[PDB]
Scaffold this active site. Structure first.
Site, PDB file in Angstrom:
ATOM      1  NE  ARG C 367      -4.060  -1.801   2.417  1.00 49.13           N
ATOM      2  CZ  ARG C 367      -4.015  -3.126   2.356  1.00 49.13           C
ATOM      3  NH1 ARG C 367      -2.856  -3.752   2.274  1.00 49.13           N
ATOM      4  NH2 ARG C 367      -5.135  -3.828   2.371  1.00 49.13           N
ATOM      5  CB  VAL C 368       3.799   2.418   1.863  1.00 48.97           C
ATOM      6  CG1 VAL C 368       4.875   3.466   1.689  1.00 48.97           C
ATOM      7  CG2 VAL C 368       2.969   2.679   3.102  1.00 48.97           C
TER       8      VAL C 368
END
Ligand code: ATP
Ligand code: MG
Lengths: 39, 466, 487, 67
Positions: C367-368
């Site tokens: 997600r990052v």
């Protein structure tokens, strides 16, 4: 040499406290007085 | 100390002591009982009361019976003379052959060896069996799953492992009979007497037997594996041997623990197993290790309930398994002995970092050639067996010679068949399969690679065909 | 040695006696001790039993105290004395733990003597709030081409390693630990990463061999190993992750960067389920207690990235989860997927088909992600990910096969970011589109040796700049084309 | 301070041990022989107390000129 040293140390420790195994409450009264001072 | 029975509910017995309570996992002995009834402390309920599970039948127990404490969890006779001898969870002789006049008694419920006592290099346990030492090698101090049945010869494989490990190395064996059928136990006793692994008249027996049958309370069936583990731990830690511990079914160990925890009133978990399933399996399997004094290698027959490999019992057992041998009936119908499925048998030490790149590459090549032979087999099912490829039939005959070379005469089957038992070292197996993979033995016929030892015996037979 | 005993072991020996507060064990069983007394004991305070064991005061009740026993309850009898310690459960933290193997309570199990720790930290502390944190920016290099290119991991992230048994999760964590050696030996002290490996429910032999693999690679000098193995009490396997997390929070709070591996969290959930069912608590899905999500989420929430007002440190967590039959929609897998910041799906089909590491690129996510890559790796990995998506859509096709074979990697072989960038460049510009696939790895090997034996200047420039400039672009182009002509 | 004057009497007793290498055991040796057995066995398989004498072997070679 170091392993023999460690094992001799181990037998020495269990032998010394076997020596205590084979082996006067003045210190008990002294600790009592100390705790009494601890209030 | 001496207490009194205050409750008897099926197989659980609550005793009450006046002065000295025994700690958990401690053997109490009931007084007046004509046989030897042993309770094992499982709980402290308070009010000087102690809950225990019985290791035998509880009929005829009276509230008020005297129960004498022992001081130790359960002490079984351990020594070099339990070999060739049957005993139960309590350590009493079952075989009606007199007492076990041993020198020392070891308590069950030991601790797994400390971290600093773990040997740190993974090492192969050479079993002298071609198909096992080549494709799915056993690791010293590992756990192996026998995915066999009744049809395929599994008792023969067990007896041959006992024989080999006793001969190649100097290791004795223990056989635990967790939850075993008494008929099959008698059959195994007599098969191991016949094949020379057990000697009733000499002191040359290579295996000690421990049995907890199916007609025994859950406590017995749950602690019998620990009894076998203890009589093996003696050999390991006091003789430096490489012991082989068999467990004729580990799922019955799991289910006996489940029954025990159910009797004690605990809330079940997924599917119904004990809440302590993982820790109960771990406190046992963690004692089958390779210490700096010796090793215990465990071969544990596995039953998969409902054929679900994700069931909590086999899924918690597979966390400890290091190898896996599958005794297919299909391979046995082909006439291969041992009928170890060469493609469904796995090992975690197969990587080249552990068995070397030579062993790894020979086994990898054999595996790939066997897979490609089964492929070319289902394409030969065309009924148009032709050879539009030279390499296809070349590999077909190479793989047939291989999958027949993964057959071996066992010493224990030397009375039934005239063939002599040929155990083969590891390097000779690697080398022979290397040759057959390099394409050398093409001029040799097929049937000279059947029930043979190393390739020397193979070419000697090939010459002797004429 | 004789006077190594009278050293101070006798003179300085704590032979004091003090007015202590006590309780008396009412009933020990199921790893819980009902204790009578301890009127002033606190909730979640560590008490000490007569046998030298230790426990946590879980249930403060009107007439008794429920104590969770950190060890075998075989060593506890009714009537045993239980002393207070006055300290809420805490563990030793500090740099004196690097190189040490400890159990869940901080005691050394490597036989190298006591840990000379001067600071203790609670195991059940609260994660940092919203203001202390800051977005993940610095890369946490694993040394694995697949991870470092497609599923990048930043410092302060939580990245699940999820997959079936025997698919290479521990190998990924061990390579991530070994890879930090090139940074821990360098000069920049803001790139050093101190690794922690919590081993829960594992075979103790496996943990010993893991410590060996770390010692041979000289990675133990900056690594803590917390071990709560298969034979240890369920409370110890429950506590081990919080002990490791506090040991890592020590670095996170003092401007340093720690990484922590929980291997694995499924076994901690199983241990907590054992404890909960033995406490007669209501079992939910799969007999798990209602608060197993809280169990994992209060833990993985402490892996944060602080801002430069709170020190600027971080703590990266790589929790491991073992699925059954590849089911990711199970209870505990989906719990930890709800907690973490991404996954690395290891597959059994890929692992059996020789593709190792068996990372499922279509399902692995971060997600990052992009915010914590180097520029050069971003340049080449963007095109690599686009082409891999194209290839999996049509499963160009030859380019995809080439790339997926370029993603294979060996065990205990973490590559520096420059060399990964060089290999991925040689793969993504087409320079082996016409080399038949099976030689690729061979080529790769040879190629990289070339680039590391002779063109160290280009790699050094890539290291300094972080990006692969147009000058370095054409330089690497001529390097790879000259090698391919030679190859 | 009664227990320090306890302990070092015992420590001096244990010091009287140049006449007995391992302090009046006649035990703990049966296992030491096995442990050292492993120790020596794989530390080497020769007279490790000695200095080593060395047999060397040198490479193979073949016809490399144009046949
Ligand atoms: N990147 C790799 N390349 C080649 N082989 C590998 C790789 N990773 C692992 N293996 C091999 O496959 C085996 C898998 O072991 P590993 O511990 O890494 O998987 P795991 O997910 O942790 O399984 P387990 O649940 O038993 O711990 C390794 O022992 C190793 O032999
Ligand atoms: Mg693992």
């Amino acid at each position: 040499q170091n392993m023999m040293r460690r094992k001799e140390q181990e037998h020495m420790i269990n032998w010394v406290e076997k020596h205590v195994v084979q082996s006067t409450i003045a210190k008990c009264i002294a600790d009592l007085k100390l705790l009494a001072k601890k209030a | 100390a001496t207490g009194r029975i205050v409750a008897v509910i099926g197989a659980v017995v609550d005793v009450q002591f006046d002065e000295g309570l025994p700690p958990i996992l401690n053997a109490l002995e009931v007084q007046g009982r004509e046989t030897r009834l042993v309770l094992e402390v499982a709980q402290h309920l308070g009010e000087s009361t102690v809950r225990t599970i019985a290791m035998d039948g509880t009929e005829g127990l009276v509230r008020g019976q005297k129960v004498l404490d022992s001081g130790a969890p359960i002490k079984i006779p351990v020594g070099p003379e339990t070999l060739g001898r049957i005993m139960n969870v309590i350590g009493e002789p079952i075989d009606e052959r007199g007492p076990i006049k041993t020198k020392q008694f070891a308590p069950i419920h030991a601790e797994a060896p400390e971290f600093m006592e773990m040997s740190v290099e993974q090492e192969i346990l050479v079993t002298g069996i071609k198909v096992v030492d080549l494709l799915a090698p056993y690791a010293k101090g590992g756990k192996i799953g026998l995915f066999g049945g009744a049809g395929v010869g599994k008792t023969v494989l067990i007896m041959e492992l006992i024989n080999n490990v006793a001969k190649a190395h100097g290791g004795y064996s223990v056989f635990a009979g967790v939850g075993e059928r008494t008929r099959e136990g008698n059959d195994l006793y007599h098969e191991m007497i016949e094949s020379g692994v057990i000697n009733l008249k000499d002191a040359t027996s290579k295996v000690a037997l421990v049995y907890g049958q199916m007609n025994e309370p859950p406590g017995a069936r749950a602690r019998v594996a620990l009894t076998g583990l203890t009589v093996a731990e003696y050999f390991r830690d006091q003789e430096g041997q490489d012991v082989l511990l068999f467990i004729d079914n580990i799922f019955r160990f799991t289910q006996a623990g489940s029954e025990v925890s159910a009797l004690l009133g605990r809330i079940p978990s997924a599917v119904g197993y004990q809440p302590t399933l993982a820790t109960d399996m771990g406190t046992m399997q963690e004692r089958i290790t390779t210490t700096k004094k010796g090793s215990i290698t465990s071969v544990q027959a596995i039953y998969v309930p409902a054929d679900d490999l994700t069931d909590p019992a086999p899924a918690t057992t597979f966390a400890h398994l290091d190898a896996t041998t599958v005794l297919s009936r299909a391979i046995a119908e082909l006439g291969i002995y041992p009928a170890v499925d060469p493609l469904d048998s796995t090992s975690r030490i197969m990587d080249p970092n552990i068995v070397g790149s030579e062993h790894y590459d020979v086994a990898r090549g054999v595996q790939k050639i066997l897979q490609d032979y089964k492929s070319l087999q289902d394409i030969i099912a065309i009924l148009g067996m032709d050879e539009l490829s030279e390499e296809d039939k070349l590999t077909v005959s190479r793989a047939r010679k291989i999958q027949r070379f993964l057959s071996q005469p066992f010493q224990v089957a030397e009375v039934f068949t005239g063939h002599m038992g040929k155990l083969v070292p590891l390097k000779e197996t690697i080398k022979g399969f290397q040759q057959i993979l390099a394409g050398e033995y093409d001029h040799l016929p097929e049937q000279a690679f059947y029930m043979v030892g190393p390739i020397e015996e193979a070419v000697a037979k090939a010459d002797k065909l004429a | 040695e004789m006077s190594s005993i009278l050293e101070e072991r006798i003179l300085g020996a704590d032979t004091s006696v003090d007015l202590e507060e006590t309780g008396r064990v009412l009933s020990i069983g199921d790893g819980i001790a009902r204790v009578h007394g301890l009127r002033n004991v606190q909730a979640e305070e560590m008490v000490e039993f007569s046998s030298g064991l230790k426990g946590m005061s879980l249930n403060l009740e009107p007439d008794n105290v429920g104590v969770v026993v950190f060890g075998n309850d075989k060593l506890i009898k009714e009537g045993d004395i239980v002393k207070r310690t006055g300290a809420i459960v805490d563990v030793p933290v500090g740099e004196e733990l690097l190189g040490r193997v400890v159990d869940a309570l901080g005691n050394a199990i490597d036989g190298k003597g006591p840990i000379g720790s001067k600071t203790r930290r609670r195991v059940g502390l609260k994660a940092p709030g919203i203001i202390p944190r800051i977005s993940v920016r610095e890369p946490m290099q694993t040394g694995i081409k697949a991870v470092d290119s497609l599923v990048p991991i930043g410092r302060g992230q939580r990245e699940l390693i999820i997959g079936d048994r025997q698919t290479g999760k521990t190998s990924i964590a061990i390579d991530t630990i070994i890879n930090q050696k090139r940074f821990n030996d360098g000069s920049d002290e803001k790139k050093k990463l101190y690794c922690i490996y919590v081993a829960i429910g594992q075979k103790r032999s496996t943990v010993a061999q893991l410590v060996k693999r770390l010692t041979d690679a000289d990675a133990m000098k900056y690594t803590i190993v917390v071990s709560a193995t298969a034979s240890d009490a369920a409370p110890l396997q429950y506590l081990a992750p919080y002990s490791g997390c506090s040991m890592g929070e020590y670095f996170r709070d003092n401007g340093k960067h720690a990484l922590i591996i929980y291997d694995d969290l499924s076994k901690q959930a199983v241990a907590y389920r054992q404890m909960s069912l033995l406490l007669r608590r209501p079992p939910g899905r799969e007999a798990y207690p209602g608060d197993v999500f809280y169990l994992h989420s209060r833990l993985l929430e402490r892996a944060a990235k602080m801002n430069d007002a709170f020190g600027g440190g971080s703590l990266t967590a790589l929790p491991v989860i073992e699925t059954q039959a590849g089911d990711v929609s199970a209870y505990i897998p989906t719990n930890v997927i709800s907690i973490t910041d991404g996954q690395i799906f290891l597959e059994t089909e890929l692992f059996y088909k020789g593709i190792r590491p068996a990372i499922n690129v279509g399902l692995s996510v971060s997600r990052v992600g992009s915010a914590a890559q180097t520029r050069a790796m971003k340049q080449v990995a963007g095109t690599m990910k686009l082409e891999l998506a194209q290839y999996r859509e049509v499963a160009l096709l030859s380019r995809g096969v080439r790339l997926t074979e370029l993603l294979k990697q060996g065990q205990y072989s973490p590559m520096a970011i420059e060399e990964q960038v060089a290999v991925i460049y040689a793969g993504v510009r087409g320079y082996l589109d016409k080399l038949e696939p099976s030689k690729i790895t061979k080529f790769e090997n040879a190629f990289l040796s070339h680039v590391v034996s002779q063109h160290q200047a280009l790699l050094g420039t890539i290291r300094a700049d972080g990006k692969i400039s147009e000058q370095s672009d054409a330089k690497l182009k001529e390097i790879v084309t000259n090698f391919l002509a030679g190859f | 301070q009664k227990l320090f004057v306890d302990k070092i009497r015992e420590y001096k007793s244990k010091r009287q041990t140049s006449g007995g290498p391992v302090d009046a055991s006649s035990e703990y040796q049966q296992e030491l022989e096995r442990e050292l057995f492993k120790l020596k066995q794989m530390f080497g398989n020769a007279d490790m107390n000695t200095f080593p004498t060395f047999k060397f072997e040198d490479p193979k070679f073949e016809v490399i000129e144009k046949p």
